Design a protein around this ligand. Sequence first.
Ligand SMILES: [Cl-]
Lengths: 29, 29, 29
Amino acid sequence: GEIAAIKQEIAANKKEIAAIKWEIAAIKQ
Amino acid sequence: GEIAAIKQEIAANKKEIAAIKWEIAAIKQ
Amino acid sequence: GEIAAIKQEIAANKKEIAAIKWEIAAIKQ
Ligand SMILES: [Cl-]
C-alpha cells in the first residue's frame, strides 16, 4: 500500500541519516 | 493519525539533515 | 494532494542525503 511504501522510504532515510552521523563522528575521530 | 505521524517523522528527518549540513560546514571551518 | 505532498518532501530529503554523502566523500578526498 501507499502509506506502507511511504513509511518504508522514511525509515530508509532515517537509516542513512544515522550512518552519516556516525561518519561525521568518525571524521572528527 | 497516520498521515500526521508520517509528517512528524519527515519533519524530524529535515531537522537532522539541517544539523548535519551545519556540522559539515563547521568541519570545513 | 496530501500523499503527493508527502512523497515530494521524502524525495527532497533523499536528494539532500545524497548531496551530504557526496560532501562526506569529498572531505575525505
Ligand atoms: Cl524523510
